DNA sequence: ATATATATATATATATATAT
DNA sequence: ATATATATATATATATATAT
């Protein structure tokens, strides 16, 4: 039923700057130069990523990391590369890292991300294929457990190519009876191409009055799902779906205190700043009551702003969305607005992000994917051929 | 008056009027055109003028500092400790 | 068609450039003095430049650069130079840099930058010819990639000869059907000499009650284009122009949702933004924040010019959506951290020195500007007032 | 409360604290901790000598506890009535001193 | 709209705590 | 023993985020 992954543009042929011999020569030129400064270090593995290259090194016993760390600006000129960056801890091992930038930034095309075992084995109605980690490993994050997401970044930093990537991660794996989609795109370019797909609950909203209406209906549907789950005993939507599935397959099709398996809503909001600039004071409380509690019910938010300042996102809203993604903020205070760290200032722009997992504070840097216009047109087409746009009219 | 003559700074404008009078009649003004002085604003004790007056003056000094360099209006602020509280 | 590059002033003959004997003497003396301080080195090559000569020197095996960065003052003392700044890491070589300010600091012609093969081949409708770098390579950065720009500095740095250099970069590459400007000047005097060219689509805004009208029109054009793209499944202006070019070359031109053409790239050059905000006030701030939050897709790029851009002048919403900062010299160091986020723009020697800060790189590309005498600009404007009619969209 | 780093258990009477503050970010054990505390309340005290009030602005989180014979009020899930139930708790404190 | 409180970057001064 | 490296206190300047 799900469309074939052949609808994506295949992997590209690249110049492949670092051939394995050009990595071996560099590892040896690294060991020699480290020995020249008094630290005896033996390289043991390499991880050529798309943009950087982590030379894992096993320093001899008695060699503190700070001895290797204070030699960054020297290994930089020794290896002729722009800038070395020592990583003190590689979790689970006894090796220090050295992240050499490449001479060429390889593009991460989206067919390369979904061809992983993490994605296909992933058992969730809403996975997100953010992109490749710095070690080339695909990053597959589960939307239903973040739960909410706050994309943000300057103009031209790859946000609505990293929201199309998320929505295509939704489309290629979940059927309309598994995950619906609400889309609120004030700037009527970057989601209006998702017209009439079998997933949408309401059309691609551009009338901000209708946007307030859609969010009102989302709150109402949320609380109706809470009534439905409480009147059965389940704890969240997952247990509810499993229970109704077992009841229906066990010859006992239940009725609503028949009954059917509920989907998982994904309320996408592209360029939230304009929706606040128009109908803000009608939507503040609606989103502050969605992001606050809509986890068990299965109504998730994708709030893609340009700067999460308090004027655009009240602190109450931004305090309940702990999972954020920063795309190349220009200054450093903007990194303090999206994240609560630096880092996001020094991102190479197109694609790159600093996906911040919920529980921790370390931003797991991720190189974004790239879903072009036609690479999405064909997905929308081949998915529209297998369903009708069964909207829900009373939302608006 | 300098944009109406095609000249970008005061020194150039005085050069233009001096040449035009070398060749005879001065410029006509959008009377008879002449040479302009070099205004020199001298605000002594620019730490109590922003305590007697305060908000009123401040942006005027700001505009003089920002724009008035090609117009010949200069400024000599005398203070005692120009911290941001003062300037 | 496009004016000839020879309408400018011809290349300025070199001014007492250091003959190789003096450079070789200074290299030998550098090696001797660094041997006196117990740092074995070897001068590989010497790169002369318009302002600073770069003594490309190479340490011995096991020489930490800090033992040179600390000696950066004694090297100026032993030489006859004012001061020396070391480049701890050169991006692409093993050597370390020793920068010497020339005694006879020469100038940077603009025809020297244009006639270079990089401008002549730069396939962008909107290029910028900033000038020569340290070594003497012409730095020419596209504008549609920035996508905005924040020129800044103090009174007397050269932030107007810079805007004129940018505009004459725009003009010698783009016909009126490829780049249309919207100039605004509070000083009534700087940009008031481009009046009459066909590129403009409105008079050079001189009276500061019409800046609000010009920017209302900019937002109107932005929305018009932003919906005209919406009606065609495109997500930017490059895709739109590619669509219409494919339509034309396939014999069947598309239709206006008349007949569509290629759209020009609007460049809203706002000179002296501070005095603008101090005359007009919050009438304009809204429209500037809007053009920042948008108009990257619609192809409306925004070049500013301020003195110490801060929240007192440029709000945090406007200054966040402007990635590319170009800072001339500034008075303090606290002032340079408002532009570049790092206090490097204080050691600039004025008279057209800048620190081009690309969008998201910790190291600013130091460029030595380009002097464009008013003779050149008057001649270019006289060439344009004849090669095309004075256009003005009257409903503005 | 679980075990210490010495393997031995750490059980502490709540009416000696007499108030407690769980915290910590997501995916750490907060919910399981609260559940363990509540089952500790359960396996030792009959409703004739202990009662509860559960107020969770994240709905259905504590709704696994519904029908317990010592559940003075149902699971307070909204925001408006939380302060009201706490005002009643203040009044109960006052009459319990009187 | 206009004053506070907080966090940050940066610059001095001061000890301790390692290299040579 | 003496030159640096790391932490800390104090003061300035700026950007946000709160309150009147
Ligand atoms: N993985 C990627 N590889 C290469 N280019 C990319 C990648 N991701 C994004 N881009 C580029 O980023 C741009 C698209 O980013 P956008 O989503 O349009 O910008 P944006 O975040 O929407 O900014 P605004 O505020 O919406 S105008 C195009 O120039 C793409 O080429
Ligand atoms: N690239 C350059 N090369 C050589 N000399 C230059 C260059 N740019 C400017 N100058 C000289 O420096 C002077 C000052 O430059 P300006 O353009 O007047 O500065 P500015 O931008 O006008 O500063 P304000 O704020 O407008 S007063 C010019 O008049 C030239 O003599
Ligand atoms: Mg976007
Ligand atoms: Mg100027």
Tokens, residue A28: 């040896």
The secondary element (H helix, E strand) that includes residue C306 is: strand C300-306
Using an 8 Å CB-CB cutoff, list chain A residues near D28: 359
CB neighbours of residue B24 within 10 Å? 6
H-only helix segments in C251-299: 273-279, 282-293
CB of A22 within 7 Å of some strand F atom = no
B74-77 vs B40-43, strand pairing mode: parallel
End-to-end CA distance of chain B: 31
Residues D95 and D98: their CA atoms lie apart, in Å, by: 5
Eight-state DSSP code of residue D84: H
Regarding beta strands A86-87 and A97-101, do their DSSP bridges make them parallel or antiparallel, or are they unpaired?
antiparallel
- Beta C354-357 vs C324-328: how paired, if at all? antiparallel
> Would the CA dihedral through C130, C134, C136, C139 be positive or negative?
negative
Closest CA to C145 of C171, C170, C119, C126: C126
State in Å, rounded, how far the first CA of chain A is from the last one.
30
How far apart CA A372 and CA A192 sit, in angstroms, is 15
- Chain F nucleotides with an atom closer than 7 Å to a protein C-beta: 4-6, 12-18
C239 burial via Cβ count (<10 Å: 0-12, 13-18, 19+): middle
* Every domain of chain A and the residues it spans: 1-106, 107-396
Report the SS3 class of residue C254. Answer: coil
R_g of chain B, CA atoms, integer Å: 18
Nearest-angstrom CA–CA distance, A182 and A218: 9
Which of C163, C159, C152 shows the shortest CA–CA distance to C335?
C152
Ligand 2 atom showing the smallest separation from residue C159 Cα: 21
Specify the DSSP class assigned to residue A308: -
Please give the structure tokens belonging to residue A323: 């999972």
Furthest C-alpha separation in chain C: 79
Q: What is the CATH number of domain C107-396?
A: 3.40.50.300
Give CA A188 to chain center in angstroms: 22
Question: Is the four-CA dihedral B1, B7, B9, B11 of positive or negative sign?
Answer: negative
- CA B37/CA B10 separation, integer angstroms: 9
User: Do at least 3 CB pairs under 8 Å connect D with B?
Assistant: no
Yes or no: say if C273 and C159 are a contact pair by the CB < 8 Å rule. Answer: no
Q: Do chains D and C touch (3 or more CB pairs under 8 A)?
A: no
Mutation target vs B (from C164, C186, C187; most B CBs, 10 A cutoff): C187
- As a whole number of angstroms, the distance between CA C108 and CA C165 comes to 11
What stretch of H or E contains D97? helix D82-97
Q: Is C21 helix (H, G, I), strand (E, B) or coil?
A: helix
Tokens of B80: 């005692």
* Secondary structure in 3-state letters for C40-73: CEEEEEEECCCCEEEEEEEECCCCCCHHHHHHHC
CA distance A344 to A339: 8
Tell which residues of chain C come right before a gap with C–N over 2.5 A: 257
Which residues fall within 8 angstroms of residue C346, CB to CB, at 6 or more apart? C329, C330, C331, C332, C333, C335, C336
Q: Is A16 left (phi over 0), alpha (psi -120 to 50) or beta?
A: left
Picking from C140, C144, C135, C45, the residue whose alpha carbon sits closest to that of residue C95 is: C45
Strand spans (E) along A173-315: 182-184, 265-270, 299-304
CA distance D53 to C104: 83
How far is it, in rounded angstroms, from Cα C361 to Cα A349?
Answer: 10
Rounded CA separation C222/C237 (Å) = 11
Phi, psi dihedrals of residue D76, rounded to the nearest 5° = -75, 110
Q: Would the annotation count D27 as a binding residue?
A: yes
Beta-carbon contacts of residue A349 (< 8 Å; ≥ 6 apart): A156, A157, A158, A328, C359, C360
| Rounded distance between C-alpha atoms, residue C28 and residue C22, angstroms | 10
Experimentally, the structure was elucidated by: cryo-EM
Which residues lie closer than 8 Å to C56 by C-beta, 6 or more apart? C43, C44, C45, C46, C47, C90, C93, C95, C97, C98
**Strand E–CB C337 distance below 7 A:** yes
Decide: CB of A311 under 7 A of nucleic strand F: yes
Checking C189-192 for CB contacts under 8 A at 24+ apart, the result is: C189/B2, C189/B3, C189/B8, C189/B70, C190/B8, C190/C160, C190/C163, C190/C271, C190/C272, C191/C163, C191/C269, C191/C271, C192/B3
- Residue pair A325/A308 in contact (Cβ under 8 Å)? The answer is no
How far apart are alpha carbons A105 and B83 in whole angstroms?
Answer: 47
Cα of C146 from ligand 2 centre, angstroms: 24
CA D31 to chain centre: 11
Q: What is the DSSP string of A123-140?
A: --SSEEEEEEETTS-EEE
Do A317 and A162 touch, CB atoms closer than 8 A? no
C-alpha–C-alpha distance, residues C81 and A114, integer Å? 60
- The secondary structure of B5-57 as a DSSP string is TT--SHHHHHHHHHHHHHTSS-PBP--B-------EEEESSTTTHHHHTTHHH
How far apart, in whole angstroms, are the C-alpha atoms of residue C126 and residue C114? 14
Cα C131 from Cα C50, distance rounded (Å): 11
Nearest to C17 by CA among C42, C67, C51: C51
Distance CA A210, CA A393 (A): 11
Q: Which residues 28-87 of chain B have a CB under 7 Å from nucleic chain F?
A: 83-84
Tokens 């409480």 — which residue?
A: A230
SS3 assignment, position A64: coil
For residue C351 the two structure tokens come to: 């008279």
Query: Which whole-number Å values give the CA distances from D5 to A18, C44, D20, in the listed order?
Result: 49, 62, 21
Closest to C156 in 3D by CA, of B40, B9, B12, B58: B9
CB atoms < 10 A from the CB of A186, how many?
A: 21
Whether residue C264 contacts residue C178, with contact meaning beta carbons closer than 8 Å, is answered with yes
Q: Ligand 2 pocket check: which of B3, B7, B11, B69 to mutate, most ligand atoms within 8 Å of Cβ? A: B69
Secondary structure element (H or E) that encloses residue C140, with its range = strand C138-142
- C71 CA vs E15 C1’ separation (Å): 26
For C373, the token pair is 């005498």
Widest CA span in chain D? 45
Residue D74 with chain A: CB contacts under 8 Å? none
Cα C282 to chain center, whole Å?
28
| DSSP class per residue in C185-235 | -SSSSSGGGSTT-SS-SS--B-STTSHHHHHHHHHHHHHHHHHHHHTTT-S
Query: Distances from the Cα of C85 to the Cαs of A270, B34, C74, C192, in angstroms?
Result: 47, 49, 11, 40
Q: Is A358 on the interface with D (CB under 8 A)?
A: yes
- Which burial class, exposed, middle or buried, applies to C386 when counting CB atoms under 10 A from its CB (0-12, 13-18, 19+)? exposed
Beta carbons of A299 and A292 less than 8 angstroms apart:
no
Q: Is A269 helix (H, G, I), strand (E, B) or coil?
A: strand
Residues 6+ apart with CB under 8 A from A113: A119, A129, A131, A132, A138, A165, A369
Q: Is C173 helix (H, G, I), strand (E, B) or coil?
A: coil
The DSSP code for C5 is G
Could you say which of A236, A292, A359 has the minimum Cβ distance to residue D60? A236
CA–CA dist A70, C196 (Å, integer)? 59
**φ/ψ (deg, to 5) at D34:** -60, -40
Cα distance between residue A37 and residue A30, in whole Å: 11
* Tokens read off for A159: 């946000």
Query: Tokens for C245?
Result: 């070019």
CA B49 to CA B63: how far, in whole Å? Answer: 16
Taking the CB of residue A81, how many other CB atoms lie within 10 A of it?
Answer: 21
**CA of C283: how far to CAs of C34, C211, C276, C327, in Å?**
60, 9, 10, 27
The DSSP 8-state label assigned to residue C325 in this structure reads E
Q: What string of DSSP letters covers A345-390?
A: TS--SSS-B--B-SS-SS---EEE----HHHHHHHHHHHHTT----
* DSSP code, position A237: H
- To what resolution in angstroms was this structure determined? 3.7
Mutate to test the interface with B, among C152, C153, C156, C189 (most CBs of B within 10 A): C189
- Enter the tokens of residue A151: 């994309």
CATH class of C1-106: alpha beta
CA atoms of B54 and C294, how far apart (whole Å): 38
Structure tokens at C126: 């909107």
Alpha-carbon gap, residue D79 to D60, rounded angstroms: 14
Q: What is the CA radius of gyration of chain D?
A: 15
Give the whole-angstrom CA distance, residue A55 versus residue A36: 18
R_g (Cα) of chain C, nearest Å:
24
Burial of C102 (0-12, 13-18, 19+ CB in 10 A): middle
Question: CA-to-CA distance for C123 and C265, rounded, in angstroms?
Answer: 14
CA angle in degrees (0–180, nearest 5) for C79-C84-C90 = 120
Tokens of A31: 């060991």
CA-atom Rg of chain A in angstroms: 24
Q: Residue holding tokens 């670092």?
A: A18
**Cα–Cα dist A301/A321, whole Å:** 9
Place of tokens 């103090």: C154
Q: ω before A188 within 30° of 0 (cis)?
A: no
List the structure tokens of C88: 């701890």
DSSP assignments along A207-222, one per residue: -HHHHHHHHHHHHHHH
Nearest to C331 by CA among C355, C311, C308: C308
* CA-wise closest residue to C146 among C365, C361, C364, C323: C323
Q: Quick one: closest CA in A to C325, which residue?
A: A330
Question: Which two tokens mark A271?
Answer: 């360029």
Query: Among all chains, which residue has been given the structure tokens 């990053």?
Result: A139
CA gap A206, A209 in Å, rounded: 9
Residue pair C163/C303 in contact by the 8 Å Cβ criterion: yes
């Amino acid at each position: 039923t799900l469309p074939p992954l052949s609808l994506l543009d295949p992997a590209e042929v690249k110049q492949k700057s670092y051939s394995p011999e050009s990595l071996e020569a560099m590892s040896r030129l690294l060991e020699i130069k480290l020995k020249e400064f008094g630290v005896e270090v033996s390289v043991d593995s390499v991880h050529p990523g798309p943009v950087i290259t982590r030379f894992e090194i096993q320093p001899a016993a008695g060699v503190k990391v700070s001895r290797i760390s204070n030699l960054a600006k020297d290994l930089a000129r020794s290896l002729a590369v722009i800038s070395v960056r020592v990583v003190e801890v590689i979790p689970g091992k006894t090796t220090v890292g050295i992240e050499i930038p490449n001479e060429d930034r390889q593009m991460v095309r989206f067919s390369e991300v979904l061809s992983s075992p993490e994605y296909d084995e992933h058992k969730s109605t809403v996975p997100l294929a953010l992109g490749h980690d710095i070690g080339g490993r695909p990053i597959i994050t589960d939307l239903a457990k973040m739960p909410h997401l706050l994309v943000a970044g300057t103009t031209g930093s790859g946000k609505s190519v990293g929201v199309n990537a998320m929505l295509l991660s939704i489309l290629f794996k979940s059927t309309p009876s598994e995950a619906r989609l609400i889309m609120i795109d004030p700037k009527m370019l970057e989601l209006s191409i998702y017209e009439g797909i079998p997933h949408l609950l309401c059309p691609v909203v551009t009338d901000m009055k209708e946007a307030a209406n859609a969010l009102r209906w989302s709150v109402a549907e949320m609380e109706r799902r809470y009534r439905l789950m409480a009147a059965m005993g389940v704890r969240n939507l997952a247990g509810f779906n499993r229970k109704v599935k077992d009841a229906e397959e066990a010859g006992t099709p239940l009725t609503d205190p028949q009954l059917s398996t509920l989907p998982t809503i994904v309320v996408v909001v592209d360029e939230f700043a304009d929706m606040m600039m128009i109908v803000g004071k009608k939507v503040e409380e609606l989103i502050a009551r969605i992001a606050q509690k809509a986890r068990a019910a299965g109504i998730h938010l994708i709030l893609a702003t340009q700067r999460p300042s308090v004027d655009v996102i009240t602190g109450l809203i931004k305090a309940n969305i702990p999972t954020r993604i920063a795309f190349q903020v220009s200054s450093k205070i903007d990194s303090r607005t999206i994240l609560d760290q630096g880092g996001a200032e020094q991102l190479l722009g197109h694609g790159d992000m600093l996906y911040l997992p919920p529980g921790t504070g370390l931003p797991i840097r991720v190189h974004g994917a790239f879903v072009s216009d036609d690479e999405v047109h064909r997905v929308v087409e081949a998915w529209k051929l297998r369903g009708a746009p069964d909207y829900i009219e009373d939302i608006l | 008056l300098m944009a109406a003559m095609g000249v970008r700074n005061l020194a150039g404008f005085n050069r233009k009027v001096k040449d035009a009078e070398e060749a005879g009649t001065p410029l006509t003004d959008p009377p008879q055109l002449s040479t302009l002085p070099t205004i020199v604003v001298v605000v002594d004790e620019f730490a109590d003028m922003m305590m007697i007056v305060g908000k009123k003056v401040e942006e005027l000094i700001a505009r003089i500092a920002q724009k008035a360099r090609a117009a010949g209006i200069h400024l000599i602020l005398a203070t005692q400790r120009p911290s941001v509280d003062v300037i």
